[PDB]
Amino acid sequence: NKYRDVEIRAPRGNKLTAKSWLTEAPLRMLMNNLDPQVAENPKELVVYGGIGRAARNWECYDKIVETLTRLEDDETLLVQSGKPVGVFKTHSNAPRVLIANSNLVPHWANWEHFNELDAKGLAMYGQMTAGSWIYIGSQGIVQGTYETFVEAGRQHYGGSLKGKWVLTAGLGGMGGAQPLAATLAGACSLNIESQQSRIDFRLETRYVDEQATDLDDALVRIAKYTAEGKAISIALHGNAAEILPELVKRGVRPDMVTDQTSAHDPLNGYLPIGWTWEQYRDRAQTIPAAVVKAAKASMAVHVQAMLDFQKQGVPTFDYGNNIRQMAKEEGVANAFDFPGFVPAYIRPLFCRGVGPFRWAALSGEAEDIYKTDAKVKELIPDDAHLHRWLDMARERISFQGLPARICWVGLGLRAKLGLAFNEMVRSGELSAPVVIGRDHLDSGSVSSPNRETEAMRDGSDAVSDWPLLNALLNTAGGATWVSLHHGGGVGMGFSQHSGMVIVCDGTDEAAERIARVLTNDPGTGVMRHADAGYDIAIDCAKEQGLDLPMITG
Amino acid sequence: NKYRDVEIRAPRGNKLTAKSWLTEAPLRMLMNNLDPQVAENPKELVVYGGIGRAARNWECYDKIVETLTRLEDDETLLVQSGKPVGVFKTHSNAPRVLIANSNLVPHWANWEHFNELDAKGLAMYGQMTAGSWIYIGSQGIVQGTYETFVEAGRQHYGGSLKGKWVLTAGLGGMGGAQPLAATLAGACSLNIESQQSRIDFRLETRYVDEQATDLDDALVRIAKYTAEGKAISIALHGNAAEILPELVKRGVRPDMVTDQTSAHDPLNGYLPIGWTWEQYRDRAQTIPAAVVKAAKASMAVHVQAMLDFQKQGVPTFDYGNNIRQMAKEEGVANAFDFPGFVPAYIRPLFCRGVGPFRWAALSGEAEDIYKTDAKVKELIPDDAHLHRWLDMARERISFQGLPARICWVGLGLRAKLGLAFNEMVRSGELSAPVVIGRDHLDSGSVSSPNRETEAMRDGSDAVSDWPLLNALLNTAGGATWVSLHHGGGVGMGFSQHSGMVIVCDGTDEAAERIARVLTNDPGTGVMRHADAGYDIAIDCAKEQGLDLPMITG
Amino acid sequence: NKYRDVEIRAPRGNKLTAKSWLTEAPLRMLMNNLDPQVAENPKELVVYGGIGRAARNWECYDKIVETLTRLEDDETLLVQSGKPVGVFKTHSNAPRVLIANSNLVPHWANWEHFNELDAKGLAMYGQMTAGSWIYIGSQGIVQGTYETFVEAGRQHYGGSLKGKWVLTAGLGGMGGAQPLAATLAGACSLNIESQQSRIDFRLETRYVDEQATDLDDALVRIAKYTAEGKAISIALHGNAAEILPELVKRGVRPDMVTDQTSAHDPLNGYLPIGWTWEQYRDRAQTIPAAVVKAAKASMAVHVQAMLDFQKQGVPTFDYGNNIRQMAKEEGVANAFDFPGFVPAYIRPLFCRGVGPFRWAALSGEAEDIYKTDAKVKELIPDDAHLHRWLDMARERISFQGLPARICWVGLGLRAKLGLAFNEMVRSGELSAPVVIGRDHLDSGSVSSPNRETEAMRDGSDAVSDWPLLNALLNTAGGATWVSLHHGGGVGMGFSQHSGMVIVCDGTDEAAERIARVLTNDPGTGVMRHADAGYDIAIDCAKEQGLDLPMITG
Numbered sequence A, B, C: 001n002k003y004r005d006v007e008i009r010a011p012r013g014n015k016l017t018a019k020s021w022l023t024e025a026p027l028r029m030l031m032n033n034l035d036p037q038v039a040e041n042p043k044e045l046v047v048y049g050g051i052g053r054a055a056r057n058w059e060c061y062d063k064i065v066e067t068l069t070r071l072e073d074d075e076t077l078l079v080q081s082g083k084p085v086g087v088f089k090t091h092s093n094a095p096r097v098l099i100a101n102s103n104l105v106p107h108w109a110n111w112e113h114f115n116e117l118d119a120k121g122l123a124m125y126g127q128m129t130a131g132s133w134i135y136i137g138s139q140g141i142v143q144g145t146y147e148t149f150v151e152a153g154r155q156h157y158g159g160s161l162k163g164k165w166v167l168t169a170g171l172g173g174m175g176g177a178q179p180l181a182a183t184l185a186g187a188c189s190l191n192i193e194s195q196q197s198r199i200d201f202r203l204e205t206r207y208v209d210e211q212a213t214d215l216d217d218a219l220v221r222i223a224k225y226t227a228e229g230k231a232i233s234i235a236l237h238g239n240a241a242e243i244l245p246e247l248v249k250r251g252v253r254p255d256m257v258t259d260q261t262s263a264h265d266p267l268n269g270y271l272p273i274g275w276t277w278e279q280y281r282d283r284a285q286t287i288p289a290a291v292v293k294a295a296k297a298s299m300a301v302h303v304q305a306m307l308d309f310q311k312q313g314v315p316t317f318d319y320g321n322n323i324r325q326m327a328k329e330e331g332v333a334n335a336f337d338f339p340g341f342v343p344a345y346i347r348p349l350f351c352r353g354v355g356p357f358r359w360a361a362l363s364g365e366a367e368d369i370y371k372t373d374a375k376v377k378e379l380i381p382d383d384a385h386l387h388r389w390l391d392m393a394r395e396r397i398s399f400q401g402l403p404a405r406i407c408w409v410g411l412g413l414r415a416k417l418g419l420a421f422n423e424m425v426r427s428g429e430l431s432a433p434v435v436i437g438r439d440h441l442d443s444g445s446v447s448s449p450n451r452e453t454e455a456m457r458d459g460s461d462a463v464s465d466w467p468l469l470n471a472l473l474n475t476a477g478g479a480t481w482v483s484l485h486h487g488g489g490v491g492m493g494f495s496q497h498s499g500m501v502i503v504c505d506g507t508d509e510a511a512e513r514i515a516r517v518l519t520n521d522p523g524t525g526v527m528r529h530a531d532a533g534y535d536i537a538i539d540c541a542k543e544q545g546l547d548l549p550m551i552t553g
């Protein structure tokens, strides 16, 4: 059915429930997706995003578990929007599970039709990692936001963020990660949020350190903590469209400026200048046209302030909330004089196949992750920023469900790491096999013109051949499970993306798959960006000896 | 350019700059429109009502002055949106100046197109009396506002406003008359104004009594003064769109609610919620589309509060700034649930041709006006209301620029007074010629479905043949200058209206023009309302012996 | 009352019904507007355009006639949308009648509101000359279309069209005038029309000389008639969007290309390529959206052919049917590479105040018009095109109602001719007074951004100050009747325009008014165009000694 009063947790240790580690792995990771410590609403099979599910319904979940438990190494289960629809003969070097969730023929790819199918029992929103069984809790968004701040810090500031501060807004579902990410990057931050209840939540969870009493107090604290070389996040109850222009007027100069207000939704996600929250919600019901106009006017003012910071040379960037387009429509003709965070910071990383390399210890032992943390530092010895992340993840990131880790590593190094992990399983240094996967947001695995593929230099934003080729190639290469999803992050109609996870069980046959998959997966991202004509990606392909017929011959 | 750091003042006494009194008169009244004691912002050519200007720019101003100085009595100057465009041969019994300001082919009659033309040097907003040179400071409207308050008192409060108070906003050139009008009607008043300089101006010219320190203070004063039976006006520095909703929330109940902010022009005349006046003016230059959106959204909130007051039983009306229209456009579907002041209170006066009839002493002598006050009482000896009006005017209305007088009289009496004043000029009782005019708000000179012709009994609100005929007839009859303006009062798209001024220079020739012009001008108003089937107007036409073919034969 | 089974004709000879010739003139011209020989549907007071009326209804007509009959020379009648609303004292040098028809406050200036008012007995569409009593039948449109073709000939072909041919389409209400106008101008013409019934009509009335059997036949006839120096009009039954592209393909070069299909109305007025008229009418009922697209697509093809002609040096012009706009919306990005006929040909004439000078013999005698024709020839002896037109008019243009004539005459000559006609009345050369007027389409008397003021060089298309000033100035100057109309030609919302008519009764007093009015009326046109910065207008202003303060000091 829809609701079940149960607690689900991944089996631990070395005892198998399934027939091998190739099938035990997806089984454990599915169950991990539903862990009370990991999942948002697992009693309704919700992993995250309110309706991002691990399985279509409880009958489907039961049958997936049943089927995985008896699946042979020469068989492949097909999961179709969270339903186990078929088992077919393949071989041990093919994936054990092939997953396609939420895919709709384009003309019908909208929430209205999704809802119609849902009513008929035909639907499940997979988000990214909800339906594809590789979600590891808040570490994803925390590490991800950390990467943006750290990369911006590498580009502008030589990786030296001590005594520097980030100015931003929004402490919501995604924005709440900003203060912690900044702190971990080594920066102070001032975080503007219009709902006190969201500040309270982020204070309670220690994502934000302190709340200032007012703007003057906020600035005193920032000046204090930066002078002392501390990395402390500060929350301020207020309105970014009021505070940012005031900071410009006062000549206050932050070291980075961004924003995570929900400016994509003027009716519901962006408080107009001068309004309480309060007035905003009340007026949204009675005069929605006026509210949208008030919010949009306020965004123009907000973006003018962001542009003013950039004119003073402050690294300034959009954090995917559509605020620049909103402002532009209001006559801020130069709204796009500051870039989106992906084109500015993430894409150059994607050009080198650097993306969010994610792994989990199937044993459940924290020590297995600590051992892999140490291995990563050993194999990548000269990279100080990676070492800092791994040092403070142990100190400041709590495991949720199965101990897991994310770090950003590129073409060449992904395979090096995966093979080392595999050798560690073989040697018994790791107590049980590990899985290596990622979010669906990687260099060669996503098409999303409003986000990850916005403003491709060749205008190819909407080309979705790439994630489809990525999934086909990872199937051919030997990933343990491969996923194709639609509409993760941005909703029905707006993205297509692929996932893969591979088990490292210490065998040489795994090593062969690992070598292929962990070369090919980032390799497709280098290819994709080289195809668009990015010099970094072309140079990376040549350095790594990638075979790109139209570039390398 | 539209800024010049100069003080403009009407020449005084009997020495002529122009060739005759027919040409000296418009020269002096143009300059009087720009007198620092008269105009809201004369260094930018702005007289009142948002950006109501006296001339298109300073080059145009200079050329108008130059041209009027050389104009012959058989010549007519054409003024086109504040620009002197042509001089043509007519005769001494035709107007010396013909003015057409702000007129746009209907499909293009909106603020967006006006602003485009303005940016090209092709436009000027005439308002009503700004572009047609018959503005006399806050006195021009003060009797109208007074008659409105008094009539509302008759309908709602048994003819007594003692112990009652008005809530309103806008202390600009015309809005500044509200506090004094309320006082003269016997009511206390709370008047919200966003610019300290405007409060200062009203304080300086004795139009408002005092300024409260905050809203709480204002409310205690209102409660005390009303309990004492006093009639004292109170200015409060703030934003009506913030204060009115707050007052609704607190359950505060004024005895009347209206508004006279410059809502007719969202870009220039109405301060958005949460904005300073400085931010408003700066942003109007850079992001005008956002500014209009913010102002209109704020008007929606403002009108919602006015509607809440009305639902609580508070007498509520639109005082002629088109605010209901602006709110309706933004989703306030019931914006017109409260009426305009004309259909509610003033129309029966228009039916008799009674309106904002006025005159000014070109000599600059206060004693010339006092002499006219005395003559009016002599000629209208039995009207207690009018005698008291004139007493209160002498006691409480400060002259601004050239001494002038507002005095609401209708068909029959306008010519009687006009002819008496001309005799006083001939006899030397008046030291120099006087000009007789009116606002364009008058019985026969305006079509405006959201103001002067709102809810006509025959549904003829939008018929604008009438003001055009009025201007043509005033030209045929021998007014000294005649105007046809678009958009005065209620903004672009919403009105068409005419103006007239006639000089009483003491001659027999002027007497003949005065006799017919001051009969015909209110005569067209009686005709217009008689056409619509108003019995008061029909009875008035018959009493005065008007020739109305479809009514009298 | 709406319908009256009567025949109305202007009184003839020298016997007065009214009190003077100043009031006899408008009376006769009103009745002439309803002559069975002149009016489209006079039993319902319709002069032209289906609903362009002389008076609002029969009661109004009766009262207008009765009032004019008793009107004194020092009195002025106000006509308000065809209704005699008031009579006021003026003087003998003011107009006897002031007319304002169809004027609506801009926000309500649309047909839906007009219709609402009409249903309440409050409305009348005056068109241009229907409500202002100066319509003289088909001579207006025939002469006007003639002037376009003649002016094009002057600009491109040294003022000779002999051996030349015009290619156009549309033989409708206005388009039907094309073949006759081309013939009179001295050119051959090929006229494409999709309805055989329309061709039949024009063949019967001799507007079109002959019908070709097919395109090849048409081309054989054109080659022959042009080679023989004949001016013969040829109709071709077909589709302009099929024929014009075929002519381009064949390498055929006409000497002028224009179009008067009803492209402004894709659903009803423009036959799609490959469709029969029956298919078009049938499909308009079942699939109107598809019909509109087929027609719009066909317009794109048609305009492509017109551009192909222009690229070859063929004088090509839009004849006010919106076709360029329609094609542009379909991806013909250079659709405005050919001009409208006004900007190209009529506007240069307007710059010199050259416009359609029209006059009528109140006597009813054809000899009166023939005498004035000869007088015009005498006073303008060196203009061969003028002489040709007047000779052409006598032989090819039939009088309708009162004998009347149109001539294009500019600043300086208009007054010269008017003073001369007046002297002929005085001397008894003319058997009775003549009226001098015009269409509302003259240099200083119309604002109409989609027609006569399209693409003003300064962007002032929509400025309607000008016709208003023209009306006011003609009232001041001494025209016999003056009119302000809205919506003529282009409909509610899209134009504002003025009329004037002046009687030449042979008196010295009329001469004084004629010298003024006939200088001032075209003078305002030169002024308007000089204001816009047209060198021709500025040069003309200086040559005629016009007093334009911002140009000449």
Ligand SMILES: NC(=O)c1ccc[n+]([C@@H]2O[C@H](COP(=O)([O-])OP(=O)(O)OC[C@H]3O[C@@H](n4cnc5c(N)ncnc54)[C@H](O)[C@@H]3O)[C@@H](O)[C@H]2O)c1
Pocket: A169, A170, A171, A172, A173, A174, A175, A176, A192, A193, A194, A195, A198, A238, A239, A240, A241, A259, A260, A261, A262, A263, A264, A269, A270, A271, A272, A319, A320, A321, A322, A451
């Ligand atoms: N492109 C990406 O990968 C990416 C990553 C992170 C966030 N985002 C974007 O950031 C936006 C926020 O995401 P979210 O999930 O946190 O949304 P959310 O709705 O949970 O959070 C928005 C927060 O902004 C606050 N807010 C609204 N108006 C404000 C104002 N004027 N001043 C201060 N605070 C205000 C709201 O109270 C809310 O807490 C979204 O548009 C999201 O798409 C995009």
Ligand SMILES: NC(=O)c1ccc[n+]([C@@H]2O[C@H](COP(=O)([O-])OP(=O)(O)OC[C@H]3O[C@@H](n4cnc5c(N)ncnc54)[C@H](O)[C@@H]3O)[C@@H](O)[C@H]2O)c1
Pocket: B040, B048, B049, B050, B051, B141, B144, B169, B170, B171, B172, B173, B174, B175, B176, B192, B193, B194, B195, B198, B238, B239, B240, B241, B260, B261, B262, B263, B264, B269, B270, B271, B272, B319, B320, B321, B322, B441, B488, B489, B490
């Ligand atoms: N009813 C009538 O007879 C009549 C006559 C003349 C003018 N008017 C109309 O009256 C209005 C005011 O004319 P004016 O000459 O005073 O204009 P103005 O532009 O001189 O003054 C407008 C005033 O409104 C104040 N204001 C604007 N927004 C405000 C807000 N949100 N809260 C508080 N104050 C605010 C401004 O600071 C300014 O002082 C105009 O719309 C004008 O067209 C009506």
Ligand SMILES: NC(=O)c1ccc[n+]([C@@H]2O[C@H](COP(=O)([O-])OP(=O)(O)OC[C@H]3O[C@@H](n4cnc5c(N)ncnc54)[C@H](O)[C@@H]3O)[C@@H](O)[C@H]2O)c1
Pocket: C169, C170, C171, C172, C173, C174, C175, C176, C192, C193, C194, C195, C198, C238, C239, C240, C241, C259, C260, C261, C262, C263, C264, C269, C270, C271, C272, C319, C320, C321, C322, C451
């Ligand atoms: N701007 C001006 O002053 C001016 C002057 C003359 C005409 N016009 C414009 O010209 C157009 C015609 O006016 P009208 O009153 O004659 O309209 P109308 O509807 O009477 O005539 C249009 C004619 O076009 C014919 N037609 C339609 N599609 C055709 C096609 N594909 N091929 C050949 N013939 C086709 C119709 O059969 C009809 O006879 C209108 O848009 C009018 O506004 C403007």
